[PDB]
Design an enzyme around this catalytic site. Structure first.
Site, PDB file in Angstrom:
ATOM      1  N   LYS A 113       0.839  -1.181   0.000  1.00  0.00           N
ATOM      2  CA  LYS A 113       0.000   0.000   0.000  1.00  0.00           C
ATOM      3  C   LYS A 113       0.883   1.243   0.000  1.00  0.00           C
ATOM      4  O   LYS A 113       1.847   1.338   0.761  1.00  0.00           O
ATOM      5  CB  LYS A 113      -0.900  -0.027   1.229  1.00  0.00           C
ATOM      6  CG  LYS A 113      -2.001   0.992   1.114  1.00  0.00           C
ATOM      7  CD  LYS A 113      -2.855   1.078   2.365  1.00  0.00           C
ATOM      8  CE  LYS A 113      -3.752   2.265   2.294  1.00  0.00           C
ATOM      9  NZ  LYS A 113      -4.584   2.334   3.493  1.00  0.00           N
ATOM     10  N   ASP A 200     -14.969   6.356   8.846  1.00  0.00           N
ATOM     11  CA  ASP A 200     -15.223   6.447   7.416  1.00  0.00           C
ATOM     12  C   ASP A 200     -15.474   5.044   6.859  1.00  0.00           C
ATOM     13  O   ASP A 200     -14.835   4.655   5.877  1.00  0.00           O
ATOM     14  CB  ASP A 200     -14.083   7.150   6.691  1.00  0.00           C
ATOM     15  CG  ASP A 200     -14.434   7.721   5.328  1.00  0.00           C
ATOM     16  OD1 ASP A 200     -15.627   8.021   5.114  1.00  0.00           O
ATOM     17  OD2 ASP A 200     -13.521   7.871   4.499  1.00  0.00           O
TER      18      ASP A 200
END
Ligand SMILES: *CCC(=O)Nc1ccc(-c2ncnc3ccccc23)cc1
Ligand SMILES: *CCC(=O)Nc1ccc(-c2ncnc3ccccc23)cc1
Lengths: 277, 276
Positions: A113, A200
């Protein structure tokens, strides 16, 4: 796929010099770069390859680091530690990141990532998200949560176990909507029960494996369940998920969890918004 | 170039079993295959028919599915819905994807896309899904796409356009008008939030009247993508290059990513890169 991108210590150590400089200067000059460094050709080549970028302001005159810059720095570091030797394709884009397949000499495949904060911003911020995540992932891994095994990290780059599954963003049909719907709602709770609301929580936070079992992936600064507005947050996390299922799978259930259900089992908010033990 | 091999339900159940087991185990021992189904000979035949493949490594010892195996499973499933009865000739080698002519009972013709990415079985399963939904959406938004018909596993059935792919067309009456039809389409995509990503001579079909249909729904990235422009400019270049080559045509009516008036949130509806 791709083996380490050859480049001289001279390129590299200068780049690093540009790293070190940004530390104490927004726009860093060759003089310092060169000081640190131990040149000006290197700089041309770096600006050529687009690993750095140069700006004269009203007041300042010198060089910055481009994401490509940082990217390399990271991979070189990680290459040193044996973690990654080889870099496959970008699998996709995350909330504010890039995810690639990578592997080591020994043939094992992982996920890399690469944090990119700047949807609208610094490399610094991305270094700190990478941190927060690595830590968050370990906490949640050791406690037998369903997350990838966090493996290593450096700068804005986070290596973790690869998952045999597609991200929920690209799932357009599932045979058991209720099953997945519930595995998700059951995950929100297990979180809260350790003191954590994500904040989120969207489709981008879930992977589905070949047997359609779930895994969580994006871990920013979370909220503590003792936060002033903990509920609202909780409310949202659930609300979102409900919507996606209703929109994607057209699955709806009046079985959505509520804050009451939370029965603190842990203090995992050992670093989270409104810990205040 | 008609119906293929008939098979015992046992043959199928075993094939199914191999599949079933590949969810949890890459190579799958008979133990499970059997357990999954209820025999060993069946396996031998599948191996023989190159439907499955057995392999032994380290400590691992068991069977896996061959592309062909997958192919059959699908067709069978498609048979069982009257959707596919017969199989014509492979039309193109024009992607990590094999595309065929097919027909149902009544004899109406459609086109079967088989996804050939390269686990592989899975990603291919899910290519198909993406492609179906994507294609559905676009169809319903009145785009020039094959009407999607059905899908299962790595297989997508869809309307069979009556025309030839641009890669096998060596002359056009009014190139300009085609080029502009193509250029429009690119735009119209971007305007609903999308970039084909593989827009090229392989993925555009010219009809009897020289009107264009699109076929590959792969990356179909969003215009909110990190590299949304580069993709865009890439797609455009293909067209330019193609005509200044096949047709010796060259216009300066390029579209630019600057020209883009978002009118829809298709990127959002179908999630192909994108934002809240
Ligand atoms: C919703 C889309 C999205 O966020 N994309 C995306 C792409 C790949 C992955 C992913 N796939 C396999 N293994 C992974 C391991 C670790 C992290 C992410 C992984 C997720 C999401
Ligand atoms: C350029 C040509 C090429 O790459 N191959 C090719 C082969 C077949 C087709 C095609 N033709 C007619 N109808 C179709 C329907 C669906 C998919 C493909 C179809 C196009 C391109």
């Amino acid at each position: 796929v791709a083996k380490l991108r050859y480049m001289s210590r001279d390129d590299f150590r200068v780049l690093t010099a540009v790293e070190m400089g940004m530390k104490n200067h927004e726009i860093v000059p060759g003089s310092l770069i060169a000081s640190i460094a131990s040149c000006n050709k290197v700089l041309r080549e770096l600006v050529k390859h687009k690993l750095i970028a140069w700006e004269r302001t009203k007041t300042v005159q010198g060089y910055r680091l481009t994401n490509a810059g940082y990217d390399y720095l990271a991979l070189k570091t990680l290459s040193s530690r044996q973690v990654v030797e080889s870099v496959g394709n970008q699998m996709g884009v995350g909330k504010e990141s890039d995810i690639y397949i990578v592997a080591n000499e020994e043939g094992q495949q992982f996920a890399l990532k690469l944090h990119r904060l700047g949807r609208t911003s610094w490399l610094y911020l991305s270094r700190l998200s990478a941190m927060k995540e690595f830590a968050y992932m370990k906490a949640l891994y050791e406690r037998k949560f369903p997350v990838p095994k966090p493996i290593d990290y450096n700068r804005h780059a986070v290596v973790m176990e690869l998952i045999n599954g597609y991200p929920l963003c690209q799932i357009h049909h599932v045979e058991d909507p209720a099953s997945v719907y519930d595995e998700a709602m059951e995950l929100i709770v297990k979180l809260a029960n350790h003191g954590l609301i994500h904040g989120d929580f969207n489709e981008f936070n879930l992977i589905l494996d070949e047997s359609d079992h779930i895994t969580m992936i994006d871990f920013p600064q979370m909220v503590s369940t003792s936060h002033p507005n903990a509920e609202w947050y909780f409310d949202r996390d659930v609300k979102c998920i409900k919507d996606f299922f209703m929109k994607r799978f057209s699955y709806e259930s009046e079985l959505f969890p509520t804050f009451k259900d939370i029965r603190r089992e842990d203090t995992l908010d050992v670093e989270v918004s409104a810990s205040g033990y």
